[PDB]
Amino acid sequence: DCYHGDGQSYRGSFSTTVTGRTCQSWSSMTPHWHQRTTEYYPNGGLTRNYCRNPDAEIRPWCYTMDPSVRWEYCALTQC
Template structure:
């Protein structure tokens, strides 16, 4: 079981991946000798669940675990804070949605209650099967594990374990968890 789980989390087959955290998202080397690599058109998703501590959660829950409404991230009322969306574009601090921009235990938000500065949100955890079969991406797509193997321009992706037609160092052995 460990082997099969590991196999599903890395650079298997010729599926689009983002092993180096490229801000444009998942990509692959192509089978076209004239096009070394290209980005893949993976739809952005607003997930309904979170993985790990929810740092990549991009859902639209906007109330805390106790039912308080979340304060907008671009607002300083009723609580002033330093998590301005323009200063943290990679954290997706949109609207008043629960997020985890600082590595807390789970997503949270500042509340609209003057008496409660912030509170955790109640976001369900994703099952392992949700994670492995996702057909959409969140953030830069580093966690994308779907099976799209064609780039935006229509090129077929080269297998990650292949060195032809393009040689590279992003092999399953060098990037076991990507």
């Protein structure tokens, strides 16, 4: 799947970064503590560890399960 524009409306299930890393679940503060949660982004579709763009980034992204890599853009292409 691909995203349109900045991907703020992307609701797919892709969960892999541009370096092949697995996205961290949005509801998790582990390994990375953060504030991109449904509490603060109720319209963001912050579901499981799905690639999302809740904060008007240029493209969908996620926190990563690698403790040494906080966040990355997802390996999704623009439509």
